[PDB]
Structure 1
Amino acid sequence: LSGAVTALILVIASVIIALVVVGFAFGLFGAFTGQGTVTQVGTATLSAGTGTLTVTLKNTGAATQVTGAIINGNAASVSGQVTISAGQNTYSISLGGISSSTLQNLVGSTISLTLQLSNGQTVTVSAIITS
């Protein structure tokens, strides 16, 4: 009974250390290439009714704007306030191009977007879906 709790604390912590090391190694690409690395902070609530995505991306480097988004393997087209200035900020990106049927069907779950930067590497956004 005692050995099943120390076997879960270690799993929970190992999920975290590996992710921290992975993030540190991800950052080394932007640190050496000379371009800032954009990563999201917190969670995002993509709206099925409007298509607006409310992210909180933070970047440490140049000011680069996104060009496209990938939803469930289907390409999209971004719009709205897309500049991604330096420092943490809030952006109301309105993606469009995919049929709204998937958006209204998939209400409640947390899908994983892939916003495509102009400069290079993309940023993976895990966004919940609201009504």
Structure 2
Amino acid sequence: LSGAVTALILVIASVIIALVVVGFAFGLFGAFTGQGTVTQVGTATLSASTGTLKVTLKNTGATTQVTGAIINGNAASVSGQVTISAGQSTYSISLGGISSSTLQSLVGSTISLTLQLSNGQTVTVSAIITS
């Protein structure tokens, strides 16, 4: 009775394995939709005095973190106001790692930043270098 029981135990266990696969696939399909996306809607300004960036970020997803920023081909780190909530509202980043040595010559012009979020997404920002 090896064939009477063994193929039976395989066909019982295979239902368990298939349901685990389908449940994991539906959980992953639920996960990557609401994982969190962030874009810019607000045409940020980059003050040349302290590097304070007044950005507006739309977030129709989960809570993310801001890790670093690419500016002028240089990486830079941030310290505070990096916890992005859901919603657009308005964000104010104290972008350290750069001084007014190179931004004094570009007052009034336009620069392109690249924020690096915590969830793998990067967001490019078109900034007006104001004073």
- Report the TM-score when normalising by structure 2: 0.71
The share of aligned pairs that are identical, in percent, is 96
Pair 1:114–1:38, CA change in 2 (3 A): same
Pair 1:22–1:38, CA change in 2 (3 A): farther
Pair 1:45–1:34, CA change in 2 (3 A): same
Counterparts of 1:3 and 1:109, CA distance in 2: 79
Pair 1:16–1:95, CA change in 2 (3 A): farther
Paired residue total? 131
Pair 1:62–1:107, CA change in 2 (3 A): same
CA offset digits 1:24-58 (Å, max 9, x no partner) = 99999999464221001121111110110000101
Gaps of 5+ in 1: none
CA offset digits 1:85-109 (Å, max 9, x no partner) = 0011111101111242111122111
- Report the TM-score when normalising by structure 1: 0.71
Pair 1:113–1:24, CA change in 2 (3 A): farther
Q: Which runs of 4+ in 1 moved over 6 A?
A: 1-31
Q: SS of the counterpart of 1:105?
A: coil
Q: 2:50 touches 2:99 (CA, 8 Å); kept in 1?
A: no
Q: SS of the counterpart of 1:120?
A: coil
Q: 1:30 touches 1:36 (CA, 8 Å); kept in 2?
A: no
Gaps of 5+ in 2: none
Counterparts of 1:6 and 1:49, CA distance in 2: 76
Q: 2:51 touches 2:98 (CA, 8 Å); kept in 1?
A: no
Structure ranking higher in strand proportion: 2
How far apart are residue 80 of structure 1 and its match? Answer: 2.6
What's the RMSD between the two structures over aligned residues? 15.6
Deviates more, 1:58-67 or 1:6-15: 6-15
